[PDB]
Design a protein around this ligand. Structure first.
Ligand SMILES: CO[C@@H]1O[C@H](CO)[C@H](O)[C@H](OC(=O)c2ccc(C)cc2)[C@@H]1OC(=O)c1ccc(F)cc1[N+](=O)[O-]
Ligand SMILES: [Cl-]
Length: 138
């Protein structure tokens, strides 16, 4: 297993048609997972499955600019289960990140950070065993 938190460099940033694939297994009794697409210290796209927010499961997405979190986007569809292997695919498209989990479309997140070619790292953290993190141009 990869060491978590894990930093995957994204050389020259992201671009439409870049597909990022994360394979891992949720820990038993997980509380949270995060994918952070970073532009330096800014987080262009935070994808945050929360396993227990007031005894509900939700995905929170947001952007962090100059150390401040913005307006959350929430998705109640929650495909992750404690103990189970998952695949997250993040396809960069011209206006959004498009996320599929286990081959099913989950959500899209509109680009708030405009300089896609400066979003040069993906941080992967939280309550998983991380199997692999990779990208390809489709
Ligand atoms: C106001 O709270 C923040 O909201 C931000 C989004 O607007 C971020 O999600 C930030 O997340 C982390 O800092 C974070 C996320 C994942 C990891 C592995 C490490 C760090 C933080 O969330 C929690 O503290 C939070 C609040 C209530 C919750 F039930 C669950 C969470 N949470 O998952 O962090
Ligand atoms: Cl920008």
């Amino acid at each position: 297993m990869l060491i978590v938190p894990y930093n995957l460099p994204l050389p020259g940033g992201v671009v439409p048609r870049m597909l990022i694939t994360i394979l891992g297994t949720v820990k038993p009794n997980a509380n949270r997972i995060a994918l952070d697409f970073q532009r330096g210290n800014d987080v262009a796209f935070h994808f945050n499955p929360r396993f227990n927010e007031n005894n509900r499961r939700v995905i929170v997405c947001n952007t962090k600019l100059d150390n401040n979190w913005g307006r959350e986007e929430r998705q109640s569809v929650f495909p992750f289960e404690s103990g189970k292997p998952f695949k997250i695919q993040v396809l960069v498209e011209p206006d959004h990140f498009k996320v599929a989990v286990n081959d099913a479309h989950l959500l899209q997140y509109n680009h708030r950070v405009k300089k896609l070619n400066e979003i040069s790292k993906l941080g992967i953290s939280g309550d998983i065993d991380l199997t692999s993190a990779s990208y390809t141009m489709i």
